[PDB]
């Protein structure tokens, strides 16, 4: 019957749980999840810009112009690059790409090339420029890389080559060339006539002299021969000078670096998702206002911070009485 006043606190039907150091699974009236745990399982445009999806082609295969990669002969601007773990279409003619990983690292800061013809096939009068291999088929006929040219002897003669290119453009130029390593001495003379050869390359900074390596090697894509490729960045107004008396796989096209920016090479088996996002990972895009996520540690865009947690939940309310 007498009047009274009581002090108390809020309870509700919440079953939300949080953890503390001294106690787990504490029921609270309110809690705030701060961990994004879901993704759309797709590769998307990044803030309106489509990526470069290399499909079955490698970076090497793309840049050298493996015939199987004609899809990527003059790609438009990209937001990022996707490459499979082991692309099928790489060096069709076997060998290697020198400092390949350092070249890939450059791409991570590039969004666009304008590929240009710097030395036309038609300009080789005293040499054959039409060399092909069954290792690089195109529509079932032997072919060769599109951006370089396999030079061989003409009328049992390989006169010493001397060609220069001056980068009269305003952009840095990525230039590619290579050397052919034959199987034996008989092959050497059959292709190039001269038994002892070299390729020398010079710019303002590059000072290269390559000598072929004759050796009997195991067949790869039908070939025991190898081709070894090289690259440099030719500055505006610098010139590149090639000299050779054999084994020279010469440039045809080179790439103007027209757009530098943030990019990356993701390894993913996924295909293009016809979709747009602000945060992309190799296994899916993220659309979240959460401050953390646990999707994948490699992301690009405006993203939450990655953590390995299976669960992050902050108490906001108080301990809820059952």
């Amino acid at each position: 019957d007498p009047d009274q006043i009581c002090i108390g606190y809020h309870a509700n039907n919440s079953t939300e749980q949080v953890d503390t150091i001294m106690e787990k699974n504490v029921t609270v009236t309110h809690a705030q999840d701060i961990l994004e745990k879901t993704h759309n399982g797709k590769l998307c445009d990044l803030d309106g810009v489509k990526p470069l999806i290399l499909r079955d082609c490698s970076v090497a295969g793309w840049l050298l112009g493996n015939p199987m990669c004609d899809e990527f002969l003059n790609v438009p601007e990209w937001s990022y690059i996707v490459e499979k773990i082991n692309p099928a279409n790489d060096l069709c003619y076997p060998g290697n790409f020198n400092d390949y990983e350092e070249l890939k690292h450059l791409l991570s800061r590039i969004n666009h090339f304008e590929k240009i013809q710097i030395i036309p096939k038609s300009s080789w009068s005293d040499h054959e420029a039409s060399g092909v291999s069954s290792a690089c088929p195109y529509q079932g006929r032997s072919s060769f890389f599109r951006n370089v040219v396999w030079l061989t002897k003409k009328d049992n003669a390989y006169p010493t080559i001397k060609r220069s290119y001056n980068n009269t453009n305003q952009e840095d130029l990525l230039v590619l060339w290579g050397i052919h390593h034959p199987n034996d001495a008989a092959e050497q003379t059959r292709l190039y006539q001269n038994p002892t050869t070299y390729i020398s390359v010079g710019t303002s900074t590059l000072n290269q002299r390559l000598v072929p390596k004759i050796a009997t090697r195991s067949k790869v894509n039908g070939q025991s021969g190898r081709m070894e490729f090289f690259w440099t960045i030719l500055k505006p107004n610098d010139a590149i000078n090639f000299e050779s008396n054999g084994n020279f796989i010469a440039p045809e096209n080179a790439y103007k670096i027209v757009k530098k920016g943030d990019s990356t090479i993701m390894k993913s088996e996924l295909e293009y998702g016809n979709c747009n996002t602000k945060c992309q990972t190799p296994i899916g895009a993220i659309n979240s206002s959460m401050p953390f996520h646990n999707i994948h540690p490699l992301t690009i865009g405006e993203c939450p911070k990655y953590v390995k947690s299976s669960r992050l939940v902050l108490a906001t309310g108080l301990r809820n009485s059952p």
């Binding site: 009047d3 009274q4 006043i5 809020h10 309870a11 990655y306 947690s309 992050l312």
Partner: protein, 163 residues
């Protein structure tokens, strides 16, 4: 709880108070009801909101892994690169999890504190004019009408008037 009020001397919470986190139940001749204490509730909202934002903002300059590639005779630096990136991911994962745990504990004790301090606000006002039941309630010696009840929540209860 550290401060002994939540699930302590006040045995349980009120589902009837949908109004704020801490507050009052009154019963007198005119009737009965719940009312949130707005100051302490607003204090707690601000502090908890600030805490949540602090935690997010402190992590803002976190480590961000980058894809790097290595060839077959660069295994040592590939392994170095991998353990470095994992190393930081493990550091930041730990920082986030521990911070959340540590602050979850403080947040629950903060609520406990606020409830005890609200109890003491009322106790110190009423003094001898109410009997302290020991369960969070005070039993008045005099008749406290709605205006008198409002004054207790205001922090404007006039002790001389009733003793």
């Amino acid at each position: 709880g550290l401060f002994g009020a939540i699930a302590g001397f006040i045995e349980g919470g009120w589902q009837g108070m949908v109004d704020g986190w801490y507050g009052y139940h009154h019963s007198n001749e005119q009737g009965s009801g719940y009312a949130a204490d707005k100051e302490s509730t607003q204090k707690a909202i601000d502090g908890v909101t600030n805490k949540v934002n602090s935690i997010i903002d402190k992590m803002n300059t976190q480590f961000e892994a980058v894809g790097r590639e290595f060839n077959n005779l660069e295994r040592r630096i590939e392994n170095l690169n991998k353990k470095m990136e994992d190393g930081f991911l493990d550091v930041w994962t730990y920082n986030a999890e521990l911070l959340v745990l540590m602050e979850n504990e403080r947040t629950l004790d903060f609520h406990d504190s606020n409830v005890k301090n609200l109890y003491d606000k009322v106790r110190l006002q009423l003094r001898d004019n109410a009997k302290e039941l020991g369960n969070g309630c005070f039993e008045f010696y005099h008749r406290c009408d709605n205006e008198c009840m409002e004054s207790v929540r205001n922090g404007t209860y006039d002790y001389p008037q009733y003793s």
